[PDB]
Amino acid sequence: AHLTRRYLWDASVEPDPEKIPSFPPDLGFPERKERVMVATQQEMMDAQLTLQQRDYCAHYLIRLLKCKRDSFPNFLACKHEQHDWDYCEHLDYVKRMKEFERERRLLQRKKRRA
Template sequence: MGAHLVRRYWGEPEPDPLTMPTSPIGEQFQERGVMVATAEQMDMANLPLAQRDYCAHHLIKFMKCKRDMWPNILACTDERHEWEYCQHLDYVQRMKQYERERRLLVRQARKEQNGSRVTSVRFLLSEWRNKSFNYFIIKISLMVMPIFCVFFFFFFFVVCAIVASFIS
């Protein structure tokens, strides 16, 4: 939850869902289903525009079953399951394609930044090679940490003693 907010905060590129797929490989990634229901069938079934997708033929069957079995609409669970499963598969495919496009954009942005970051990479490598400095910092932190802990506990006990003297 909130992963898209983190991506926006860090400034990672995101694909535009209205113009996907942008890469030629992306077009081969998702083989969209073939529209089984024709426009005339969807018009005759009075399907809303929002539901005229690749699963419309399942929805038409489901609506026909509900109409034919009117008092007992629970008899149409198989048709409803087929339609919902088709909707789920379509959603999963769209999310996979969106994530793939996002990763391609991130990879492309990283490749563009690598050219400008050659000097910073060299600087990091030189710092990494300077192991004596790193070991010095680690030794200092290991020496200071016990002293800090002793000081903290001493301060804590002194404060507790002062508070206890005021209470009693």
């Protein structure tokens, strides 16, 4: 594993999580589109989400809480929006793992150029 490797292997080719992203985002990519937030600041502020929950995928969290409020007290029937919000949190986690593996391949590029 990565945790298995960075203890008692080389830490130059293996990233540390506190300096992520260490590289500027301009190298490797010609352009990057920003993650355009579907839920805006006014709808998020009026929906009153906690600052831990205000991620890049609160667009389905607001729909989850709206369907839970409009489907009270049939809380068993609000699992589809929980599945969609967990899929969007899985997409945020695959973007985080993608920037992790892009950081480790860019450090491999740094150690190949050096």
